[PDB]
């Protein structure tokens with residue numbers, strides 16, 4: 016496979032064996048960031064907001080045809096707002112955890128940078144890893 | 158296999174040792190003491 | 198600040214060497230965290 | 238062959254000519270922060286079964302900061318004098334070695350010595366030498382430091398709540414830091430060192446005079 | 447010396463590391479005795495307050 | 498009213514009088530109210546030890 | 550709904566085993582039985598009960614309403630899977646398969662519960678399902694199934710502290726360890742009596758208090774009794790509401806031996822009446838007697854036998870046949886003299902009796918691996 | 928508050944000198960321990976019985 020480690024003899028550089036599987040550049044990224052993984056069972060009294068966010072995120076994966084029953088395009092963008100310390104991060108983490116999507120937040124940091132590219136002159140280079148883990152959700156702070 | 162011819166035809170053990178010493182020794186101690194208050 | 202109180206309430210029972218968190222440690226904590234609310 | 242562990246970054250604070258003569262009474266007017274770091278470091282080192290028994294998740298590492306000359310080095314001197322555990326005291330701008338690899342190995346063998354040695358205490362000063370914010374993958378003088386932060390960022394995650402290894406880190410400017418270092422599970426406790434007031438100030442006058 | 451920066455060029459990074467190594471090497475964890483430092487400038491304005 | 502600091506004095510005085518007149522749980526209650534009141538004053542300079 | 554559910558089985562005991570006692574239990578057991586949809590658990594309780602000839606419409610109206618709840622589950626599943634939540638079929642029967650757990654038997658419970666266990670990715674519902682399995686395994690005394698979900702529970706008590714799911718669990722280990730005759734573990738699981746709560750199964754907290762004192766008075770020695778249960782305010786104020794039990798404990802600690810028999814026949818008599826004690830009341834007081842004999846008799850060496858009748862409890866020949874049956878039972882370390890009328894004691898070293906249990910366990914495990922060695926290799 | 932704790936303190940120190948004078952021997956008469964404590968005999972017999980209990 017491309018991007019895989021090997022064993023290699025040294026005198027003629029003949030290919031020897033095939034070791035492990037290294038590590039996906041995204042797993043390293045989320046390991047660096049360490050979002051506080053969450054669930055529905057640690058939600059305090061936000062149930063109508065849960066009913067809102069299910070309609071935008073939960074439904075257009077489990078039933079993409081259900082919007083084609085209404086002939087309307089699926090939503091793509093979510094804005095959450097409120098004071099800090101109000102469950103934004105655990106909510107957005109939790110919804111991706113229960114719908115099984117790759118929760119990827121961006122911070123614009125430069126420790127992240129080496130797993131995106133050598134320079135990654137755009138932000139758009141993230142989309143290779145995004146469509147490589149295609150059922151995924153992108154998160155942002157303020 | 159197991160031919161075995163016919164010449165003839167916890168929950169259970171601590172209670173069984175209570176039955177070993179105590180199979181039938183006064184059963185319901187409730188009034189023998191009060192029958193020995195006046196004799197003893 | 199709810200978690201800021203409820204995490205802190207064990208420090209009171211710990212600093213008096215308890216092993217069971219009591220209800221007065223919580224009101225002992227609300228007067229500290231809401232004092233931090235009173236700070237600026 | 239397998240080896241008994243080794244590190245050169247520091248031995249172990251050789252304990253004879255190593256404890257800076259500094260009493261707790263030498264610090265006047267720090268009743269909040271002295272008792273607070275007493276809660277933070279050595280009280281889980283001794284009374285671990287209360288933190289386990291009530292289960293209040295004792296802190297892994299602690300950060301302390303503020304304006305310079307507020308006793309940042311001094312408190313580490315006094316705690317280092319009155320500790321019973323082993324103590325590892327490194328100078329935080331020495332991981333920038335000329336050769337590659339000596340940096341990252343110099344990172345990991347310190348925590349290997351804290352692992353093997355004792356329920357000990359790690360002290361790091363001038364973290365601004367390592368934990369910056371911006372990076373530039375065109376020098377190597379920056380890529381090295383990037384790897385230096387990735388090593389200890391892995392290694393602090395490589396704990397299991399059972400080892401009693403505490404990390405004390407003191408800096409001057411909290412602004413030039415990555416909050417990825419300040420994520421919970423790695424750092425939770427933050428201690429500013431506010432300028433002396435007129436109340437703690439007199440106490441310092443009494444102690445020094 | 448320098449004051450500090452909000453991290454402009456890549457060159458000033460390790461010079462700040464050099465400076466902080468000097469700062470810790472002055473009065474961190476040492477009986478700094480019998481060793482006296484004499485310094486001089488034409489402007490004492492571009493300096494670290496920690497220095 | 499506006500005051501906070503004199504409440505510490507009257508609750509601590511209740512902590513004197515209920516144990517001095519032998520009502521232990523009410524004295525623990527008033528002592529507890531003196532604790533959770535006395536947490537919120539920036540300067541109990543002598544009332545700290547007086548409560549201690 | 551399993552939260553009031555233990556009183557039902559306790560009243561099945563109270564109906565069945567005291568044979569004279571067969572009127573009010575079949576009154577109130579019927580009161581809870583032919584309402585709240587209970588259908589399965591009383592056909593052989595009806596065998597132990599009378600004919601109750603016209604139960605047929607009573608069956609049909611309740612399996613009819615059971616059919617209504619069943620068919621509205623069957624109305625729930627397709628709109629549940631149609632627009633999907635968190636697999637809302639098993640989100641429905643993770644609430645209503647417990648209704649089917651009470652109402653139906655354990656099978657419609659268990660395949661729906663091992664079914665629904667794979668849904669809730671957080672333990673906050675998983676461990677409650679495990680609690681339900683603990684309770685129904687307690688009901689049918691599924692002594693192997695409790696050993697499974699005890700450990701399977703405990704595997705989920707690590708992550709988090711969850712002391713309302715750990716101290717809550719210690720109640721279950723205490724009730725099973727007092728179901729079996731494991732008393733020194735039972736009071737040890739009954740250590741806290743603080744985090745223990747106004748529960749569903751001992752709706753009187755004080756009934757739990759009576760249980761932990763009844764097991765503790767065997768399970769611990771004097772040093773502990775003279776610190777723990779005597780100085781606990783939280784244990785003291787609830788037996789302060791008890792006239793008999795406060796007397797029953799303090800008669801032993803305060804060396805009041807004659808009234809200790811009087812209260813002892815009361816506690817033993819109620820324990821004889823008691824469900825989930827009734828397997829071992831005959832083991833309880835035969836230990837209480839020899840323990841009380843140890844407490845008084847290990848003070849003196851030259852105590853006569855004719856002092857114990859008036860000073861301890863009446864009946865000289867009863868003390869004769871009692872004590873003997875205990876020296877003869879290999880405990881109660883003394884050696885009674887007869888024709889000069891004195892009781893003499895000794896002190897045994899902890900070298901022969903400590904040896905004795907080792908030859909017991911050694912011969913037992915030798916029988917064990919002896920047997921398995923016969924089992925393998927044909 | 929002093930008068931509250933003098934009884935329990937009296938029990939503690941009673942047992943402290945009590946185990947002090949029981950030390951040196953193998954066996955003794957209780958009249959000698961009542962004399963050497965300078966105390967009665969029934970209270971000493973009951974209290975020593977509480978010790979061995």
Ligand SMILES: Nc1ncnc2c1ncn2[C@@H]1O[C@H](COP(=O)(O)OP(=O)(O)OP(=O)(O)O)[C@@H](O)[C@H]1O
Nearest residue numbers: 263264265305306307308309310311312441473496
């Ligand atoms: N009780 C006290 N509280 C605060 N400062 C004190 C006290 N006693 C002495 N000092 C002075 O404060 C200084 C604290 O030294 P320390 O090196 O800890 O400062 P710092 O906060 O680490 O600042 P920097 O990081 O720039 O060294 C000492 O040089 C000492 O002269």
Ligand SMILES: Nc1ncnc2c1ncn2[C@@H]1O[C@H](COP(=O)(O)OP(=O)(O)O)[C@@H](O)[C@H]1O
Nearest residue numbers: 057058059060098099100101102103104105200
């Ligand atoms: N409803 C809630 N239930 C439980 N915890 C909450 C709730 N709201 C906020 N928190 C706490 O707030 C913190 C997360 O804040 P959040 O709002 O997710 O991000 P931000 O504050 O940066 O917007 C967590 O530590 C969490 O425990």
Ligand SMILES: [Mg+2]
Nearest residue numbers: 306309310474
């Ligand atoms: Mg310093």
